[PDB]
Amino acid sequence: MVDAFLGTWKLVDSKNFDDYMKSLGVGFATRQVASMTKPTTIIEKNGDILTLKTHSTFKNTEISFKLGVEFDETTADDRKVKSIVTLDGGKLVHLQKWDGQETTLVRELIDGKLILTLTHGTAVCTRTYEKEA
């Protein structure tokens, strides 16, 4: 019923992380500070509205949305994108698009361990979160 996604998550591992930010053309400087960190994600429902908090010593972000309703967003890479978040069968999918090109932040539950796969063209990353109270 989507509620398994709620709570506070903590990074416990990540592989290919760096090739993903190079493929989006993120700067080394930026790439390395933010690659050394282990952030805390929060997933929060509020009626219709959800929210993705990112908490790292590097960046702090909150985005609220309705599922299936598109929105404008600037990332922390500064690209104006068109974004939409959906639920495709217990896979939470965040699509981001701009000028004929795009990227996917897909967040599943495999174990009780939220996996987030990150696909930008021929460039894939996996990042595992564990739950907290």
Curated annotation (Swiss-Prot):
(9Z)-octadecenoate binds at residues 127-129. GO terms for molecular function: cytoskeletal protein binding; icosatetraenoic acid binding; long-chain fatty acid binding; long-chain fatty acid transmembrane transporter activity; oleic acid binding. One of its GO terms (cellular component) is nucleus. The modification Phosphothreonine is found at residues 8, 30. GO terms for biological process: brown fat cell differentiation; cholesterol homeostasis; fatty acid metabolic process; intracellular lipid transport; long-chain fatty acid transport; negative regulation of cell population proliferation; phospholipid homeostasis; positive regulation of long-chain fatty acid import into cell. Keywords: Acetylation, Cytoplasm, Lipid-binding, Phosphoprotein, Transport. It holds the Pfam family Lipocalin. Its main location: cytoplasm. Octadecanoate binds at residues 127-129. The modification Phosphoserine is found at residues 23, 83. It is found in: Cytoplasm. The modification N-acetylvaline is found at residue 2. The modification Phosphotyrosine is found at residue 20. Belongs to the calycin superfamily. Fatty-acid binding protein (FABP) family. FABPs are thought to play a role in the intracellular transport of long-chain fatty acids and their acyl-CoA esters. This is Fatty acid-binding protein, heart. It comes from Homo sapiens (Human).
